[PDB]
Amino acid sequence: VRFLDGHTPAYDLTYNDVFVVPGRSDVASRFDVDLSTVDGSGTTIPVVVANMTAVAGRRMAETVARRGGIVVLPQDLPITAVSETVDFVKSRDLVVDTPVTLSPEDSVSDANALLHKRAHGAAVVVFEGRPIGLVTEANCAGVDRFARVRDIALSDFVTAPVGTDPREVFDLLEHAPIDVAVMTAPDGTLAGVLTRTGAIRAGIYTPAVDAKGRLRIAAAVGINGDVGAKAQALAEAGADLLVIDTAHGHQAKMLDAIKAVASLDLGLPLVAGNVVSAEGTRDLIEAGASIVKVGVGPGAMCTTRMMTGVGRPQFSAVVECAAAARQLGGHVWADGGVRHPRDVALALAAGASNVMIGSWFAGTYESPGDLLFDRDDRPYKESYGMASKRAVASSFDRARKGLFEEGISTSRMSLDPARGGVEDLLDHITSGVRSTCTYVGAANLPELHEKVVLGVQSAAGFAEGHPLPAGWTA
Amino acid sequence: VRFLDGHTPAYDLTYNDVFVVPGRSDVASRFDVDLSTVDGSGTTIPVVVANMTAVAGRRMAETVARRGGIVVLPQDLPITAVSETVDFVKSRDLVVDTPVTLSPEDSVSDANALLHKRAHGAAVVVFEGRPIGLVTEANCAGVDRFARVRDIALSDFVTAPVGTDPREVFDLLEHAPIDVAVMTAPDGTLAGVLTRTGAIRAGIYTPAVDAKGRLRIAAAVGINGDVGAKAQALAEAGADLLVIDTAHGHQAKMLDAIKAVASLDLGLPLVAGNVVSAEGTRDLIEAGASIVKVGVGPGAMCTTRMMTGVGRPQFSAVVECAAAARQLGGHVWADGGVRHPRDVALALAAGASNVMIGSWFAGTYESPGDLLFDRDDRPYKESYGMASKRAVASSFDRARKGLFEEGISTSRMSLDPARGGVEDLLDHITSGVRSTCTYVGAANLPELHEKVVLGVQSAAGFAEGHPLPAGWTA
Amino acid sequence: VRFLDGHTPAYDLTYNDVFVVPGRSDVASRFDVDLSTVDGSGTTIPVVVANMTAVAGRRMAETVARRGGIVVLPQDLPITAVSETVDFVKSRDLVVDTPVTLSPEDSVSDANALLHKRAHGAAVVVFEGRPIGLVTEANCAGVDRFARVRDIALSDFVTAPVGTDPREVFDLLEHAPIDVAVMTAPDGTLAGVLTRTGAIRAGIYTPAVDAKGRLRIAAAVGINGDVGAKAQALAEAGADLLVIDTAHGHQAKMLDAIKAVASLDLGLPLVAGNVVSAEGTRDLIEAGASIVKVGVGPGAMCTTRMMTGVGRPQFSAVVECAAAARQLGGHVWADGGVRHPRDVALALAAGASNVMIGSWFAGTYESPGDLLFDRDDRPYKESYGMASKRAVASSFDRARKGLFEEGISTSRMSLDPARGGVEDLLDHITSGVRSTCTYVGAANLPELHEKVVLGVQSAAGFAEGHPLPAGWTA
Ligand SMILES: Nc1nc2c(ncn2[C@@H]2O[C@H](COP(=O)(O)OP(=O)(O)OP(=O)(O)O)[C@@H](O)[C@H]2O)c(=O)[nH]1
Ligand SMILES: Nc1nc2c(ncn2[C@@H]2O[C@H](COP(=O)(O)OP(=O)(O)OP(=O)(O)O)[C@@H](O)[C@H]2O)c(=O)[nH]1
Ligand SMILES: Nc1nc2c(ncn2[C@@H]2O[C@H](COP(=O)(O)OP(=O)(O)OP(=O)(O)O)[C@@H](O)[C@H]2O)c(=O)[nH]1
Ligand SMILES: Nc1nc2c(ncn2[C@@H]2O[C@H](COP(=O)(O)O)[C@@H](O)[C@H]2O)c(=O)[nH]1
Ligand SMILES: Nc1nc2c(ncn2[C@@H]2O[C@H](COP(=O)(O)O)[C@@H](O)[C@H]2O)c(=O)[nH]1
Ligand SMILES: Nc1nc2c(ncn2[C@@H]2O[C@H](COP(=O)(O)O)[C@@H](O)[C@H]2O)c(=O)[nH]1
């Protein structure tokens, strides 16, 4: 990248210490620029969900892939579970979202636990495939948590067939007291759900599709065991991207695993990490990987920076690894340290093909973790790190390792009471990246890398401006 | 009853204004006295659970009937639901309690919502009828609320066949880290659960059984509609006692309903209410009822005392109605106003055959209401009154009545963190009644009525002594 | 009245110390009993709004008279103001309520200050008489308080002509997101507003009408000055009842004023007060008054009980004055001390023709005082007493009296966040009185006096039962 004249700091910079100065801009609207990545991951937006078990899940995978991102399935899960997740994700529609389906035979608790699994805010109830009503939080607040759901269904809900123009759906939901509309198949069976905000998004975003036209999804494995067999098994079942993720990516085991996956000629683009050095990035590229994950240490749940002096400020690491990868035709991802949309924009301008986002997304409805309400009754979720799952390999055997593996750190990730959905932070991040592109004047992401000019700011320089409202950022 | 010389107050007395003075006592241990009632309800202890939908339920019915009480099924429930409740209650064992059964296919939320449905504190998991482990609160605290239960089962649990002496079970649970022991059938199938405290109680209490030997249960109906048909339907399905419960028991509709049930010659003893007058009690006895419920107004959720000057201090009402009923060979129950075991003892000495307890029991695990945790994270349940269900009889039709029916009052009934089970308040109440009998010197409940001497105390006289600890009383 | 045998207390009783015991009841539904008073005031419900400047006003007068009560215009107001109030009150419709009318030329502050002047919760906007939309609190929360109202009008509102059956209106508002429906004249001009709850009430209550068919209203004067001229002036302008109200009603000036008004032969029934003695009541009856107000001292803002030993427990005073008035064919009103509906029921059973309610009603939208929000942001109003206006008669002249007149006491009267309207407390009071009548078994108010049986309870006897929720009672 290009820095301002005289900006040659003697220290490595994180996101807070570096900024972007505007430049020659010819575009006007932020919809003119495109966010499609060129790394081969196929994402039309530069957002990638991390490999954390508290962030990556079925609902988040489907939701993010619908809006143009990709989600990496967490490492160390049964092959059956990840295969089922992939089948569900690629079985969903490209445009209409799937609501929370409940049969009247279910219990009220089965509703109250699922209304917050999606950003819709109101689950749907189906009877032999026919959607007969909606179930909201206000309906289940006063009822026993184990009465039949049929006691809670309300018949005031908007219906529309699949293929309906979102323009009409928006006006239908304009006067509807509930922001949820049921989309039904031409035979009347429930096909999905189209939120008013989701209806608006349907014309803005474009889903990341595979060669068949289904939602893209990524899977991950560790370096322990037969990495080749695990990668081949994940390839058999649906998979659009392979990510080899470890706490330390500059290991001999890392290179051996990359070589093992590359020798299988699966055709899937290969992603590895993490290294915060040009030497590590070029070594991983040479080993056969197509993409190199960068961040080790800036992870919001990563205690390596505190257990050990090992780490690096994220921005400088991304810049160096991006230069190293582009010298060899590879690509890199920024991993961790993503608290604000400015982090996404800064990492993308630093040369990353896209940005891998972790615990920030875990504080949303679509995250696999269950929603909790704190002492002050604010929506939040307890996000936790991968810990030993990123490291190399009886109860005594478990205790021998777990005594010295870094503890599973947990942070209270609060949701924004209004924009609590993952699509809402996707909107924030996409708006930020588009604003950065317009300010720079670049119409596409490689142009965003090429034309950006960066500068160094002090701690007080980070203080100016307006901070984010509650819940929009970690 | 007999009052002290010169104690002729000019005001009606509640429980707080009256006390018991000791007398000639020949018994020493409180196990020497028996608490069996003579009203025909068959309860070996004078505790009866109220007819409130927040107190009476399947679990409370079974638990209280096991320890010698009886529970009245709430009025205005479907015939199928009450029939299923009765079948379950009479299908359970007389000695061993039933634990919370979970299959490994269930979700973690289905456990976490049920561990607090019983006072055991740890649910059991069954696989094809074989109990394979226990599930406690500490196990489910850190796991996602929708993983399979099999991920939570712990194999450290005590096993013992049915018919095992509780003496051995107590010593088995002496060193067991979990206070829950699994009782299994001779073929290995799960038959029930025997808590250490429950094991101790098994030798103290004696269950209230019917003519067949199954747990007794009572059902209730209102005065609206075909009361005779409803009573006959409740008689067809298992039922050990019929309670006609209304907000006002001195009505012509009340007498007509009593006559209708009496003309059916069901044989079941008939209970009616509520009247706080001797004239009302004798009228209800003449109408055909065998038992008259007394309290109207002292109910902890009854807002009639505040909506209207209508009401009465509970103790004087119980004394007068007891005298009226005993003049005619009938029996009476104290209804409402039961906050402390002293209330039970005072009502029983006042002449009531047994005591009908309401919202105090609703603050327990066995109550049908779901357990909630307050702002300070203390276990409590939101108990609510019957409201319009105790009164005589489209959405407009519902709004016409509900606008003027008394609102469903709700109170924050806190559980005691240690003795939160309904059996624990049963132990407190039974210990109090036995202590009252020993202090009076009576070996049986009619002797408790006959030999008791009461006195009147001021508000300051209620201040002396030690108040109950948190959660033991409402 | 009749007390229980042995209930002969040595102290005068307030509402809290006395209760009602049920009796022979033949009626079942509380709509069977009628609440019409026989004192000649014409009120179909026993609720009368006090003479306090913080309670009696145009909106409260119209609202209470619509539901069957009467409101006494405060003493010491200009003749023009009370004449305008009377003309407005008698100019309104008997069934449909009038909403808050706003022209688009008005300011947003003129809306935000008026949305809380009525219990509707959403004002109406008219353009040349045509209602073009509604204005709610949520609409004005985010806008500058001085933009034009036209920027706030929302067109989603239900319309219905006058004479429409409330059955259809209820179903129309069933799915409407706003609880406010606009009632329009057959030519399209705005005629009033029919709230869903108001639509239900329209079939329950019956308005108190004059000989012409317009809403009844009462006016009040002091004893100072030419009381005859003031009464004649109030008679010229519309008036349905004359109330001579003073702090001390057993004065020679009181008798002289009563004689002066009686000599005018206005025909309007005459009400005077206040005396808490049989001698005072009979003296005021002899002086020419038809009704005697009783309470002096129990007033929630009356500091006479604290400045002076002068006063009386309200219930005993009402009983004695009721007996004194009925010995002479007169009638009495309970004045002050009305915190709960039980107070209304107890005073009515004590023999009062109806109940005069004060600061309890001032904590409502319809009260003339402006709504305030406290430190915790809870809706409340600062109710204040009449102070020197109830007593007999330059800045020095003002300071000479005001230094020794009792200070204007002020209390923080909180509204219930849900049922904050005066019609809602009217519903509570009417439901309480009807419940008392049904428990007693009386079908009409003189029968409620005749058939009621009362008893004395201690302070602990007042503790039993459930307290009111927040905001329902003072
Ligand atoms: N009735 C009903 N059950 C559902 C629905 N979605 C999920 N479930 C059930 O709830 C379980 C947990 O839901 P998931 O969201 O898949 O699980 P999770 O661990 O919370 O999150 P993921 O990582 O997305 O799997 C599923 O295995 C189903 O048994 C729904 O819409 N309706
Ligand atoms: N797996 C499992 N499900 C249970 C168990 N007990 C109850 N359930 C289920 O949970 C539902 C609610 O339990 P109940 O306690 O009967 O219902 P409630 O309304 O909370 O209380 P009750 O008044 O006692 O019925 C039942 O209808 C069953 O479907 C148990 O031990 N194991
Ligand atoms: N635009 C508009 N102005 C109103 C409305 N009602 C009252 N006002 C104006 O606001 C003033 C105060 O309203 P009122 O409620 O009559 O006065 P108050 O002193 O608050 O209470 P009252 O004792 O009922 O008179 C009136 O004199 C009118 O000028 C309304 O519906 N629309
Ligand atoms: N070493 C380590 N890294 C973690 C852990 N949990 C998450 N990470 C890293 O941090 C990233 C997410 O960081 P975030 O975007 O939440 O700031 C993950 O993609 C992963 O690279 C953990 O427990 N240990
Ligand atoms: N009028 C009335 N009585 C109630 C209500 N809920 C409970 N009760 C009465 O109060 C009794 C329980 O009182 P507790 O024992 O909780 O003080 C019940 O058995 C019933 O008689 C209600 O909503 N209204
Ligand atoms: N002496 C006196 N009585 C007052 C004052 N304000 C109200 N009152 C009395 O108290 C009554 C209202 O009492 P409430 O119904 O609010 O308890 C009024 O109708 C009036 O009789 C005041 O300032 N002084």
UniProtKB/Swiss-Prot annotation, chains A, B, C:
Annotated pathway: Purine metabolism; IMP biosynthesis via salvage pathway
CDD domains documented for this protein: CBS_pair_SF (cd02205), IMPDH (cd00381)
- Report the SUPFAM superfamilies cross-referenced here: CBS-domain pair (SSF54631), Inosine monophosphate dehydrogenase (IMPDH) (SSF51412)
Q: Which residues form the active site?
A: C302
GO terms under biological process: IMP salvage; purine ribonucleoside salvage
Describe the disruption phenotype.
Knocked out mutant does not require any purine supplement for the growth and does not exhibit any growth defects in media containing hypoxanthine, guanine and adenine.
- EC numbers listed for it are 1.7.1.7
UniProt cross-references to Pfam families, sorted A to Z: CBS (PF00571), IMPDH (PF00478)
Q: Is NADP among the key words of this record?
A: yes
- Give the top-rank taxon of the lineage listed in the UniProt record for this protein: Bacteria
Q: Name one GO cellular component term.
A: cytosol
Description of activity control: Activity is allosterically regulated by the ATP/GTP ratio in a pH-dependent manner. At pH 7.8, GTP has only a minor positive effect and ATP only a minor negative effect on the activity, however, at lower pH values, the effects of ATP and GTP increase. ATP-dependent inhibition can be restored by increasing GTP concentration. IMP and XMP are competitive inhibitors.
What Gene3D superfamilies does the record tag this protein with? Aldolase class I
Q: Sorted alphabetically, which PANTHER family does this protein's record hold?
A: GMP REDUCTASE
Q: What is this protein called?
A: GMP reductase
Q: What gene is this protein a product of? A: guaB1
